[model samples]
Target: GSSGSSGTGEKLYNCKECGKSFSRAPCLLKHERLHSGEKPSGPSSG
Candidate 1:
């Protein structure tokens, strides 16, 4: 019954680069690649 982190809030997963945080590990992993100069491998954003 808590409203504070229930459906209106978000969880922050921190990163080792730039103090950035993401909602999931996958997101954090991809964000980390940016600082490592690694291109995200997957289908085109288009």
Candidate 2:
């Protein structure tokens, strides 16, 4: 029942400048790091 509910979908937050959207707030926050030139963990910068 819960799985079949249409209202159970994740809410998307849209970026004002690029018009890009995210399913979660944390994801949006992480995306903002890219604009700020914040490097990721480990050898890769992603």
Candidate 3:
């Protein structure tokens, strides 16, 4: 049995700030924030 499936490696989210491409939303957002210097609303320190 041969399944006719294509695009096994496709990316969804892409970085508008750069030419980099990401497969996840969170990763893309994190990279974008790196350029924008935008941090999370909550603290990260312990």
Candidate 4:
């Protein structure tokens, strides 16, 4: 029932592979995977 409960904590989420930090976890996660590998979503790309 609370709206501010989301994204109200430490914004910096460390990057597992590059030792970098990002405010939004998804931002680093998405870029990390893409940078590390092609990471095709699935057969959908085929």
Which candidate achieves the best lDDT against the true structure? 3
Model 1 vs. true fold: TM: 0.39
Worst 10 residues of 4 by lDDT: 3-12
Quantify all predictions' global Cα lDDT against the true fold: 0.70, 0.64, 0.70, 0.65
TM-score of each: 0.39, 0.35, 0.38, 0.35
Predicted candidate 4 versus true structure: per-residue lDDT over 1-46, tens digit per residue: 7745466574545666767777777887676765544565665753
Give candidate 1 misplaced runs (Cα > 4 Å). Answer: 1-13, 37-46
Q: Candidate 3, residues 8-40: lDDT per residue as tens digits?
A: 855556777767877777888687767754564
Among these predictions, the greatest TM-score belongs to 1
The predicted structure with the larger TM-score, 3 or 4, is 3
Residue-level error in angstroms, candidate 4, position 45? 12
Clashes of 2: 0
> lDDT rank, highest first?
3, 1, 4, 2
Model 2 clashing residue pairs (backbone): none
Model 1's alpha-carbon lDDT is 0.70
Candidate with better lDDT, 1 vs 2 = 1
> Count of backbone clashes for each model?
0, 0, 0, 0
lDDT tens digits, residue span 1-46, model 2: 5655367666555566566778888888677556643464556655
